[PDB]
Amino acid sequence: LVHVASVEKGRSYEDFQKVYNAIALKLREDDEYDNYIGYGPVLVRLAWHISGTWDKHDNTGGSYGGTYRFKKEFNDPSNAGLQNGFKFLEPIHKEFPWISSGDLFSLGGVTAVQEMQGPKIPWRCGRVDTPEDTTPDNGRLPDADKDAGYVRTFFQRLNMNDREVVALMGAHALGKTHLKNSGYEGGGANNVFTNEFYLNLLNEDWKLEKNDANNEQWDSKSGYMMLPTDYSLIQDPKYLSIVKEYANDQDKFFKDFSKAFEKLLENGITFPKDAPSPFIFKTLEEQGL
Ligand code: HEM
Ligand SMILES: Nc1ncnc2ccccc12
């Protein structure tokens, strides 16, 4: 099953930079959301969930088909809360109705990471909306109650190795868990992209507690939290070495996250040899906007 990227007709870098800028302006404008976290973190999570349905074995799921717009995937229990990111992107899609759904959801993640001071993430256009019958069934996104072996095996389906898994999980510096969405609570209110997930794993005094939904999670007196799957990155000796590497090298973490995140957003897509090169969008700050 082959999904060939097809550039939206006549569009080029400038058109996508306009979409980027509308997303970024709205991120700056709509600042009250989720106790003043703003929409950055939920847009990063949306981009990952629309991508993380991919199965390398048969090329089902993945970001190409924009299938999150269909009720089966919109209503996936694993996606609870992402409706806020979808609603955020609705006026962007209205303004730019030519962009495909998969392009818009993945570009919403790139724009959020960059606007939150994260690394540049090269991004390629050309995902093409596919019909409702192509929507992947629920249950392809990962559980949070599990251990390192589960996380390792899970991510083999997405063709991610240990370093890619540890780098991608660094996005859990951002935003927070919400008891009503996932049965976990807490994390604070961070909306700046840094390597602090790894510093918090290594440096905080973690206690295994039960939350009000009767699920275990690791909490610190300082008010931080880690899901069991987060904490597993310091329980497994291979993951731990990489957590220490990223805790000690911001640039390395930025570069590795950028590559893994682009890869995640592009899994399943065949780019023609004459496709445009990946675009690197300028931030609003770089543009003086
Ligand atoms: C083992 C893999 C993962 C598990 C089990 C997991 C689990 C979760 C859970 C339970 C939440 C809270 C949802 C809520 O209550 O609103 C969450 C939030 C989030 N996740 Fe993950 N996640 C994983 C991997 C990732 C990856 C790979 C990324 C992106 C690279 C990511 C980005 C985020 C972001 C940015 C949030 C915050 C959303 C917000 O503040 O609304 N996650 N994740
Ligand atoms: N802020 C977070 N800290 C640690 N783990 C997480 C997991 C999901 C969302 C946010 C966080």
Side-chain angles (χ1 to χ4, degrees):
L1 176 54
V2 176
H3 292 316
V4 179
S6 182
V7 174
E8 289 91 331
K9 180 163 216 145
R11 306 285 169 177
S12 59
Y13 176 76
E14 75 198 74
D15 298 280
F16 297 101
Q17 180 74 65
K18 290 170 185 180
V19 182
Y20 178 108
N21 285 356
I23 295 167
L25 286 160
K26 192 182 176 53
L27 275 174
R28 172 192 290 172
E29 178 63 15
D30 290 353
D31 65 333
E32 67 289 341
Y33 173 71
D34 205 2
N35 296 296
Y36 291 86
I37 295 169
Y39 285 93
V42 74
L43 291 181
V44 174
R45 196 184 198 233
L46 176 62
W48 137 238
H49 278 208
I50 60 96
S51 295
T53 58
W54 187 59
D55 186 338
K56 66 185 179 178
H57 298 98
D58 63 3
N59 198 26
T60 58
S63 69
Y64 183 90
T67 54
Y68 174 88
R69 71 194 193 271
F70 295 121
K71 66 186 182 284
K72 175 172 69 177
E73 181 170 353
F74 198 82
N75 289 332
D76 185 349
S78 302
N79 290 336
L82 294 184
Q83 304 92 333
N84 295 295
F86 187 78
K87 193 209 306 186
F88 173 99
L89 293 170
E90 282 187 303
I92 311 294
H93 218 165
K94 184 153 170 243
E95 187 175 356
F96 305 95
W98 53 265
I99 194 166
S100 68
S101 287
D103 281 358
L104 181 57
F105 303 146
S106 60
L107 179 55
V110 166
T111 298
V113 170
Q114 293 191 173
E115 292 297 306
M116 290 188 292
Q117 311 163 229
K120 296 289 201 311
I121 317 291
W123 176 87
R124 301 186 85 161
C125 72
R127 298 166 187 76
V128 177
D129 294 353
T130 60
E132 189 157 16
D133 74 354
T134 70
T135 304
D137 285 349
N138 293 176
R140 293 171 175 230
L141 294 160
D143 297 330
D145 60 337
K146 305 282 198 291
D147 65 4
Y150 169 85
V151 170
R152 177 171 286 121
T153 294
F154 173 89
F155 274 106
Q156 289 170 172
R157 201 198 72 221
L158 294 175
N159 189 38
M160 298 294 181
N161 69 17
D162 286 359
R163 295 179 65 79
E164 291 167 318
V165 165
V166 175
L168 286 169
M169 210 77 69
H172 281 178
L174 302 169
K176 63 188 189 183
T177 65
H178 305 85
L179 202 74
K180 283 189 178 71
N181 290 342
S182 63
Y184 291 100
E185 173 66 34
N190 181 57
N191 56 13
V192 179
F193 194 102
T194 66
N195 67 344
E196 69 164 283
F197 172 76
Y198 308 101
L199 291 160
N200 288 350
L201 274 169
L202 294 173
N203 295 335
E204 295 296 306
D205 186 8
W206 296 108
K207 305 304 185 194
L208 179 59
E209 301 185 329
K210 265 183 169 182
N211 65 37
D212 285 347
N214 202 32
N215 299 316
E216 290 191 317
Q217 57 179 70
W218 293 88
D219 302 321
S220 76
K221 53 93 152 68
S222 291
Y224 296 106
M225 65 80 75
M226 291 288 166
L227 297 165
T229 44
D230 289 333
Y231 195 80
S232 84
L233 303 188
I234 64 170
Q235 293 178 306
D236 177 276
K238 303 186 195 81
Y239 287 153
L240 175 62
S241 295
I242 304 160
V243 169
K244 293 172 174 177
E245 179 183 353
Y246 295 148
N248 286 286
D249 192 335
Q250 292 181 99
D251 187 54
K252 184 57 153 42
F253 164 58
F254 267 37
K255 285 178 175 152
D256 284 357
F257 178 88
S258 174
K259 289 179 168 79
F261 195 59
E262 181 176 7
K263 173 181 168 174
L264 178 72
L265 270 45
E266 292 173 359
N267 274 336
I269 305 172
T270 297
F271 294 96
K273 64 173 177 60
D274 65 343
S277 298
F279 299 134
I280 297 170
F281 299 113
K282 297 176 189 80
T283 61
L284 294 178
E285 184 174 47
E286 286 172 330
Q287 295 170 89
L289 298 174

